[PDB]
């Protein structure tokens, strides 16, 4: 049996990993066991005090996040803020499958990392976005996964097919709305319900958001040209969901762009291209590992437009982690990962 | 193979039955086929124009609700407004399993039906609330099921253990908040998003709500005493969820009340009694077939208080329908019905 | 010119006092000036860092909450958590008008205060609910005001006319839903947007909420029967608004109850009795100082039902404070207090 | 006295005009009277059945929308869907002040109008955006006003100072989120609460939205350069508010751009440039006629970023209508128009 530990089990990403594992077929038949659940200060509390939706695990006592407690598990999810997985990965048995939700091993340019995160670059692990060209093969049998950030997942799925086929200019604009669970459950006044309800605001604008270079990195993997990214995130009064509106200049006809998206995504089970006349909505993908995508051309503005909707906690985090865990373990990639949303 | 038709497939309850069937183990192993999907004016359209979250069924063409279309199915869900079940059930075989989400066959007193619904009584079918004393036995192998209303489900789960144990007075008060999907997807000005968002309102107050006699009927099934029900529903700015606050006068001690609930619900897989110090929240049960329940005693007011949270679309209707379907077909009662909520 | 200080200016109640003062006619004609704005940890920041909606005051620097800073003001609003007004009030001049939004001076029974607040009783000041029988006369020319809690404001307006006329039994039940701004802006995980959005929950149930004795106290002021209060508050996903559903057994006819509410409220400018066939909604009173009320009789359950909607930050706090301020200073009671809501 | 009629009084824009008129100083001192309130199918009903927040007018009976009904009024607000206004305005006296919230008289190019609205071009009236260069001159003493659309108001305020100073390129991108009251109150399934709540969706993308040429026309008024507009609107689960994220290739450093916005807006009472390190939020402007603006430069992407927040119903429509009314009547422009938002 694959014994699984979750570090950061009391946070939003850790809770969603547990939700997905509880529903995974390997948990049903005993090939996957849910072992130690650890955190920082929540140690000693029961899991139900943080995740009342996870009633089968509510009685579990949260433990300290120490190598000894996380030891003895074949797979370890790290659902912590960036800064801990580098040292934590080193203390663990190297045979252990380590799936890091944080950013520590995402970036391939050490100088880019130091500019945006202000610490020593730890390195890079296989990127947990299996639909990216080349990425799936690197995850088969791997023992190290860097799960993508939520906004990059939406932006890259929206944009890479057009850019890989040289059908748009490499200067892209991304304005993405997001529910507030993407910010984590650490209490701040700016994330308070009364503040968030009934309001929308852009934040970390004009290149300072740390996902900007992660989008750039993913796009550079499919083109020769110099990539620039204008990325604006906008917080909206929903708990989950990302709707990324992505634009770039183009002179290619719509029919060519449509065919490029059909070719890239016809055999990708989690990507759904909208029928003609329909557009994505975050409500349709909530609680699923799906991305819903539509493309169009603004002829007057000579601008390509791609819309992508994902659940930030599933395809944008925990579902990507479980998807990559499946590939790493040699299990069917779709195990435990529904494409069906929970709407309305 | 059990072939299933869903009448009212384009509505909220029909869409949620379909979501649950797609995840049901009998669908996965071919024991259950999803057959004809019918409606009224939406006949001729594709299901994706109504339920974009159900992408595996998006291509299905909605058919007319006609006995010729519903025939040849081993099971037929009726997810229609009340008024059509009697005729449709007359036209289907007695061996066909018919599961009615509407009210037509819920009430056992013709005079009560006439007073609250203004029409002749159709009769009554086994009530699809398996947790009620005596209900499960009536549902095993049955071919006719009347699924309960969503508010009675919450209220009856909150109250019947105390009342059946003679630990409270039979004059009960229920004030229940509900998300707006409980009203259905028919477009009215009062259900418009701009109206509902940011606002709460009680409606159909002081005994005019048709679920009042349904609550009373379920309580009279566990006591000979003179039941009265003060029921106030309150619409709140959520899409799903019912939180029923239920009260009754008592002089019994809390210890005896908690023991009554633990005895009644210990072996009930969908009922979760909150640990000491915790209270239910609708967010914890969304997308699950669970009910979360806590009880307390207000000594100064000599008042018993029971709180119950359910998802109105799952345990409040479509999950109850599939739960009853499982019992009717001799399948494991929990098949396809998770207790794990989709939160936050 | 009346110089006004606000202690706790960085909080929700303090911000709403300032919003109302900015729109008060005395502010427009110079009779009223907004002086010191004080807090605790927030001292040293600008007001716009806390209340970006108050742009005319955004540049104001928040000052420490000290007697020296607060001195030299004709009126001082205290918008602090309970337990600080006694120590702060005793350091101001007795001729200073002190208006306390907290509970410190609301309760008239020292033993009840100690039970529910766990500290020594400070005493009691004129209660800032002018519509209560006898209350308005105690406020005229006063220099001490204890502003009521938000739930008691709704429950008392819903219930006192029936109880004062001996038309209902004195055992009352109140189930009130509230937007999340009633909990204050101090950051807790339970108040985070992702948690409160899409979810509802009762809290502090079965008589432990500190507003239970405050409701009982107001009701005891209109009757000599023994009062008891079953009070359940319910957090819902809105930022503002309280909808109180209040019930009591009755043997009086509806016409008599209706007449008692018309008599009590016909001359009350902030109280609006719903037209026949209409019911209150919190969205209709947001941003106004109004209460919208309807009453009914559940004949089958021999139960009176009263529904009251207020804005918890206006008539439930800062509007009541400004309303009482007007009375204390001899200004027209409605000055700066609109009855028109901001909907949708 | 100025007698005012409102056509389309039962809708969202008409109701918000009435809210502002009720708080206008001319209404308080008798110089403005609220006369005929008209609609289509809601004629015969009372206004309270549509706008329960407008309790001082709740008793008013809605009348049919006929030119003879609207005659005899010194000022007429038209808050109807496109069409109607032209036919109605032709039958009204040329000495009547007509303020049209619809699009009929906004556009100055008949071929553009035909292409996006599919009807004959009625002409064009002075555009009701007083902050636009040259606009205030045209509004003084005018008897005809075309009020701008909500999204163009936000986009033009965000972009025109940069473009007028030739500091950015004329190919602009706008992605704007909007609360659902922008869609009007006509009941459709796509606007119902359960659909809108918890979901976000772009609509009318890639140049098909009718506000695209309106944005382009406003920008052409400040540059003789060729303007292109990529405009994407996104519906979010709020009832009010527009947050426009506007980008363009930059040819300038932030200091020059900030200075240009300071110069353009320091005089403007409704336009608030955010302090250093603060960004707009729609919650801060709800219920006010304010727009909050911030600008930035993404150096790595060489992209100018401008964020604008307004209330879609106030500065986006009814507030702009009343603002232009003041100017046309020779009244103080800010009369009845607060800059203070109703937050949280
Ligand atoms: N949330 C998303 O949508 C999303 C999407 C993509 C990627 N991610 C990434 O996933 C990671 C988790 O984010 P989140 O949203 O889940 O935040 P969160 O809800 O606040 O949870 C953070 C968890 O990490 C634990 N923790 C914090 N510091 C710790 C320390 N020194 N040692 C051990 N445990 C510690 C916390 O334990 P305590 O309870 O004791 O504090 C908590 O359980 C982040 O790195 C994020 O970048 C998140
Ligand atoms: N929604 C809940 O939370 C809930 C909970 C418990 C019980 N129920 C009960 O389940 C039933 C469905 O409620 P709902 O929320 O799903 O309403 P809904 O969303 O508005 O949809 C109703 C469905 O019934 C179809 N329909 C209406 N009239 C029909 C007719 N003459 N012939 C054939 N089909 C017709 C409609 O087809 P078209 O699309 O063509 O109109 C539609 O698909 C109700 O009786 C309700 O009491 C609902
Ligand atoms: N909010 C409502 O709906 C409502 C309704 C009715 C009555 N009330 C009552 O009004 C009062 C304020 O509630 P709230 O919702 O506004 O809470 P809040 O949003 O969290 O703000 C509390 C304010 O009090 C300040 N403060 C806290 N401790 C202080 C201390 N030792 N010394 C000086 N200032 C201190 C805080 O300043 P810092 O920012 O520096 O911490 C803050 O500005 C409460 O007593 C409440 O019971 C509230
Ligand atoms: N809503 C916004 O945020 C916004 C912002 C900027 C500009 N505008 C513009 O303002 C106008 C009103 O939009 P809205 O949001 O208020 O829509 P709405 O909420 O649906 O109301 C539309 C109003 O127009 C009336 N009406 C409809 N058809 C009519 C007809 N043949 N004859 C007479 N009256 C008719 C309606 O009366 P009945 O009740 O009888 O149907 C109703 O009162 C639109 O042109 C819009 O472009 C709106």
D47 burial type by CB count under 10 A (0-12 exposed, 13-18 middle, 19+ buried): buried
Residue C178, classified by CB atoms within 10 Å of its CB into exposed (0-12), middle (13-18) or buried (19+), is buried
Cβ atoms of A121 and A113 within 8 Å: the answer is: yes
Full DSSP string of A43-64: TTSBGGGT-TT-GGGTTPBPEE
Q: Where are the alpha helices (DSSP H) in chain C?
A: 12-22, 25-29, 67-70, 85-89, 110-117, 135-139, 150-164, 193-196, 211-220, 254-265, 319-329
Cβ-Cβ contacts under 8 Å for C155 (sequence gap 6 or more): C172, C174, C176, C215, C218, C231, C244, C246, C308
Q: Catalytic positions of A, please? A: 150
**Ligand 3 center–CA C8 separation, angstroms:** 6
> Tokens standing for D291?
């727009």
- Interface touch B197/D12, C-beta < 8 Å: no
Extents of the domains making up chain A: 1-147+313-331, 148-312
CA distance D77 to C114: 59
Question: Hunting for tokens 């159900």 — which residue is that?
Answer: B54
Task: Name the closest residue on chain D to residue A193, using Cα atoms.
Answer: D344
Helices (H), D197-318: 211-220, 254-265, 282-285
A-to-C residue pairs, Cβ atoms closer than 8 angstroms: 76
- CA pair distance B288, D90, nearest whole angstrom: 59
- Measured over the CA atoms of residue C268, residue C271, residue C272 and residue C278, the dihedral's sign is negative
Name the phi and psi angles at B320, rounded to 5.
-55, -40
CA-to-CA distance for A146 and A129, rounded, in angstroms? 9
User: Whose CA is closest to atom 35 on ligand 1?
Assistant: A40
Q: How far apart are CA C114 and CA A59, in angstroms?
A: 35
Peptide bond into B344 cis (omega under 30): yes
Query: Hey, which chains touch C, using 3+ CB pairs under 8 Å?
Result: A, B, D
For A41, residues 6+ apart whose C-beta sits below 8 A from its C-beta are: none
Ligand 4, atom 31, residue with closest C-alpha = D40
CB contact under 8 Å between B196 and D193, yes or no, is yes
Look up residue A147 and give its two tokens.
Answer: 């799960």
| Atom of ligand 1 minimally distant from the CA of A43 | 40
Question: Which residue's alpha carbon is nearest to atom 3 within ligand 1?
Answer: A182
Alpha carbons B204 and B184: distance in angstroms, whole number: 16
Using the Cβ of B343 and the Cβ atoms of chain C, whether some distance falls under 8 Å is answered with yes
B27 lies within 8 A of chain A by CB: no
Spatial distance between the Cα atoms of A268 and C146, rounded to a whole number of angstroms: 64
Is residue C328 a contact partner of residue C142, using CB atoms and an 8 Å limit? yes
3-state secondary structure of D330: coil
Mutate to test the interface with B, among C216, C295, C298 (most CBs of B within 10 A): C298
Q: Which residues of D223-253 are buried (b: 16+ CB within 10 A; e: fewer)?
A: beeebbbbbbbbbbbbbbbbbbbbbbbbebe
C150 is catalytic: yes
Q: Which ligand is nearest to the CA of D7?
A: 4
Q: Are D211 and D162 in contact (CB under 8 A)?
A: no
Q: Would an 8 Å CB–CB cutoff place B191 in contact with chain C?
A: no
Ligand 2 atom with the shortest distance to the CA of B15: 16
Ligand nearest to the CA of residue D10, numbered in listed order = 4
Give the count of beta carbons closer than 10 Å to the beta carbon of residue B61. Answer: 11
**Tokens 């599939």, located at residue:** B322
CB B4 within 8 A of CB B35: yes
Q: Is B107 exposed, middle or buried (0-12, 13-18, 19+ CB in 10 A)?
A: buried
Through-space distance between the first and last CA atoms of chain D, rounded to whole angstroms: 37
Cβ-based contacts of C185 with chain A (< 8 Å): 189, 192, 194-195
Phi-psi group of D211: left, alpha or beta (phi > 0 → left; psi -120 to 50 → alpha; rest → beta)? alpha
Please state, in angstroms and rounded to a whole number, the distance separating the CA atoms of residues D239 and C101: 30
Alpha-carbon distances of D209 from A99, D195, D313, rounded to whole Å:
44, 21, 19
Residue A52 backbone phi and psi in degrees, to 5:
-65, -15
Contacts of D199 in chain A (CB under 8 A): 238, 241, 281-284, 286, 343-344
Q: Is D46 exposed, middle or buried (0-12, 13-18, 19+ CB in 10 A)?
A: middle
The Å distance, Cα B161 to ligand 2 centre, comes to: 32
Q: What is the resolution in angstroms? A: 1.7
Residue of D nearest to B241 (CA): D194
């Amino acid at each position: 049996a694959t014994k699984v530990a979750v570090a950061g089990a009391s946070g939003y990403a850790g809770g969603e990993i547990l939700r997905l594992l509880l529903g995974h077929p390997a948990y049903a038949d005993g090939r996957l066991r849910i072992g130690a659940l650890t955190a920082a200060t929540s140690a000693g509390s029961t899991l139900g005090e943080h995740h009342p939706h996870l009633t089968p695990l509510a009685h579990r006592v949260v433990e300290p996040t120490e190598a000894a407690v996380l030891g003895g598990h074949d797979a370890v999810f790290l659902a912590l803020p960036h800064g801990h997985s580098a040292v934590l990965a080193q203390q663990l048995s190297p045979e252990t499958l380590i799936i890091d939700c944080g950013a520590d091993f995402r970036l391939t340019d050490a100088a880019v990392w130091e500019r945006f995160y202000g610490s020593s670059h730890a390195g890079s692990w296989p990127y947990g976005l299996p639909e990216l060209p080349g990425a799936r093969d690197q995850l088969r049998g791997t023992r190290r996964i860097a799960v993508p950030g939520c906004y990059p997942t939406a932006a890259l799925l929206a944009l890479f097919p057009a850019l890989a086929a040289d059908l748009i200019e490499p200067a892209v604009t991304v304005v993405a709305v997001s529910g507030t669970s993407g910010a984590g459950r650490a209490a701040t006044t700016d994330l308070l319900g009364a503040e968030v309800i009934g309001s929308a605001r852009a934040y970390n604008i004009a290149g300072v958001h740390r996902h900007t270079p992660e989008i750039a990195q993913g796009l550079r993997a499919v083109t020769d040209r110099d990539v620039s990214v204008s990325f604006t995130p906008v917080l909206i009064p929903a708990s989950r969901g990302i709707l990324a509106t992505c634009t770039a200049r183009t002179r290619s006809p719509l029919s060519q762009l449509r065919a490029a998206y059909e070719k890239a995504y016809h055999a990708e089970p989690f990507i759904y291209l909208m029928p003609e006349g329909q557009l994505p909505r975050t409500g349709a993908v909530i609680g699923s590992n799906a991305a819903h995508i539509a493309v169009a051309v603004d002829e007057d503005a000579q601008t390509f437009v791609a819309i992508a909707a994902i659940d930030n906690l599933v395809k944008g985090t925990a579902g990507a982690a479980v998807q990559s865990m499946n590939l790493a373990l040699g299990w069917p990639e779709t195990d435990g990962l529904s494409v069906v949303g929970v709407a309305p």
